[PDB]
Design a protein around this ligand. Structure first.
Ligand SMILES: NC(=O)c1ccc[n+]([C@@H]2O[C@H](COP(=O)([O-])OP(=O)(O)OC[C@H]3O[C@@H](n4cnc5c(N)ncnc54)[C@H](OP(=O)(O)O)[C@@H]3O)[C@@H](O)[C@H]2O)c1
Ligand SMILES: NC(=O)c1ccc[n+]([C@@H]2O[C@H](COP(=O)([O-])OP(=O)(O)OC[C@H]3O[C@@H](n4cnc5c(N)ncnc54)[C@H](OP(=O)(O)O)[C@@H]3O)[C@@H](O)[C@H]2O)c1
Lengths: 340, 342
């Protein structure tokens, strides 16, 4: 059996990204069997994740950064969920479902199957393994329980709080016993934070004249913990409102990914307030996954965590949905359905 | 219960840099040489004063509270210093003991909260050292490096404002721990001292380097594990660019930053600290550092100025970089003074 395999390719390096910086192609095929003699796994790709860090990979870097750049002319890759068609690797059998880095394509031959995780709970919707039970959820789990060193009762702020990482941090934090406030870019998202996601309070950053004062309002006694997804002047504001011994988990600074650079002027406050500002990367924490899968599956089962996906249908729509990320167009975790 | 003259330096008023005229020596004041009846207080004859850069901030009025209370116009300047106990109604302090802690810019200070005085346990060390290397500055170095920097033998360490009081000590601590240590300073005379007196593996003049990012690449081909941060600003940008995965930045002081996102990719811990939170560490620190001095395994240069009347100048001087070493003011020599100097 040789079948058609559509692909989305990076046309070329970027210096914001445009939908034209990628190209769907239909003039390609794959054999539905793993090469003889390999330790490899062939996946039918079911779901894709759009993640902001994918932007960086579309630019060429002289010195090595944290992930390999994309190769022009080759498919885009990123997190996704797949079904095992064929396998010459012992830990994976035909009919198993998995998640991990795969190609923006209908079918991927995974030469390094050590970096695929087997899906242990079929009871759960498979798309969850793009986000809440995939990379994004684990990011939240590490960022909050580990980097933020939280303590019950502490005052927690979360930027980009309706996003995939944000919405999870908030719920983790409320269930730990913290006061949790979120910021987002639309009243629809703010509504979701207060009504679906259980946030003690939230507000629209686009519709607040002074971020520093806005935060003073929700944190009269200042902020103990800032889960940082956005960066820029929102960080300055937070710094102004941080409490002695406050902690900032630097998850991302998405405001800067396509800009060029914006400056932070408050940093000296980190001294007077004895703040720990610490970045982290989820790739370093895959060891914590098994415990995390169990915690979060139970949380879902018990209806004690909520999760909103933004779903887009068809591989052809993946470039748009990725670009859309950066303009706030996603309402929840951006997933692309390749086949169901 | 004699009454004597007590000269004082007062803050005339709040400042919006400071001038010598923003302070005033006065001779009118007097003091009883006995702690009030019923108090648990300690009366000091003030021997030495420290000039420290953070004093500048206290000369400005702050609407919102910052880390230490502002100075009060009309009241003496206060800061770290060394004193001899004249009288005490507090059990842990006796007449003739020497101590350091916050005292007044004056000949005599009545200390109402003596829990924040540290006893001097080695009176054979020059007492002036307890302004700086064995006082607040040294401890700042001790905690900043051994604690906040979480160092490990062999790691590549950078220190800004390295010829300063804190910097100079961080560097030596770091060398003796087994680290490669490079310093930055603002004059070739200071760079010379870092390499020849202070034991730094390398150093350079930041004023005479066009690109700090490249400058640092040069001394750290494999990047920086640890940055002891005294300066801030673009020097921080540069460092961040040369930091290694899992690198650590101890924010001691700073005197816009655009590359903060790097903290994520490189998994950096940037952590501020304040020495007031670490007084518990003093006793162990005193022992380590005294031995280090006794064994001639740490070096230290003081800039000494004589007389209370010169303190304002020396503090201003500090802020314009004019001090060569830790800036001390001699208010009065302990009876029986016999330490040589230069
Ligand atoms: N291991 C890691 O370090 C790790 C792992 C995963 C994610 N991340 C980081 O986490 C952040 C969010 O991840 P996610 O997958 O959950 O993304 P997401 O929040 O689901 O999508 C991006 C969101 O960011 C907000 N946004 C976009 N541009 C913005 C701007 N210029 N200013 C303010 N807000 C903006 C938008 O919400 P608004 O409507 O609120 O504007 C948008 O919904 C990103 O910074 C990403 O790099 C890091
Ligand atoms: N607990 C704490 O967190 C704590 C405690 C004590 C001190 N500190 C801080 O540590 C820093 C200095 O402490 P210190 O006692 O050692 O003071 P100091 O270094 O004796 O005085 C500051 C020195 O920094 C250098 N400098 C000034 N502007 C600079 C710039 N723009 N770039 C680079 N270097 C510059 C000057 O010499 P060169 O320009 O020639 O290098 C100057 O002598 C200050 O920020 C101070 O507040 C913090």
């Amino acid at each position: 059996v040789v079948v058609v395999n559509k692909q989305v390719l990076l046309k070329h390096f970027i210096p914001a990204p445009k939908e034209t910086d990628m190209e769907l192609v239909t003039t390609g095929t794959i054999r539905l069997r793993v090469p003889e003699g390999s330790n490899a796994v062939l996946l039918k790709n079911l779901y894709l994740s759009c993640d902001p860090y994918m932007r960086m990979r579309m630019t060429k870097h002289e010195e090595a950064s944290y992930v390999d750049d994309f190769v022009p002319g080759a498919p885009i890759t990123g997190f996704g969920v797949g079904k095992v068609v064929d396998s010459s690797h012992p830990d994976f059998k035909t009919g198993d479902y998995v998640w991990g880095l795969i190609g923006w394509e209908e079918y991927s031959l995974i030469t390094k199957p050590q970096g695929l995780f087997k899906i242990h709970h079929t009871e759960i919707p498979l798309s969850y393994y793009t986000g809440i039970l995939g990379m994004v959820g684990l990011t939240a789990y590490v960022g909050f329980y580990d980097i933020c060193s939280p303590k019950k009762g502490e005052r927690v702020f979360v930027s980009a709080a309706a996003g995939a990482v944000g919405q999870i941090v908030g719920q983790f934090a409320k269930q730990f016993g913290c006061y949790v406030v979120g910021s987002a870019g639309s009243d629809e998202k703010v509504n979701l934070l207060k009504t679906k996601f259980g946030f003690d309070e939230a507000f629209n950053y686009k519709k607040e004249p002074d971020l520093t004062k806005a935060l003073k309002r929700y944190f009269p006694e200042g902020i103990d913990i800032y889960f940082e997804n956005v960066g820029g002047p929102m960080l300055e504001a937070v710094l102004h409102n941080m409490r002695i011994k406050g902690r900032i988990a630097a998850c991302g600074m998405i405001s800067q990914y396509n800009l060029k650079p914006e400056g932070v002027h408050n940093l000296f406050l980190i001294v007077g307030k004895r703040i720990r500002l610490e970045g982290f990367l989820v790739f370093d924490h895959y060891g914590s996954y098994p415990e995390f899968e169990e915690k979060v599956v139970q949380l879902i089962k018990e209806e004690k965590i909520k999760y909103l996906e933004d779903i887009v249908e068809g591989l052809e729509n993946a470039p748009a949905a990725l670009i859309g990320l950066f303009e706030g167009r996603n309402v929840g975790k951006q997933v692309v359905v390749v086949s169901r």
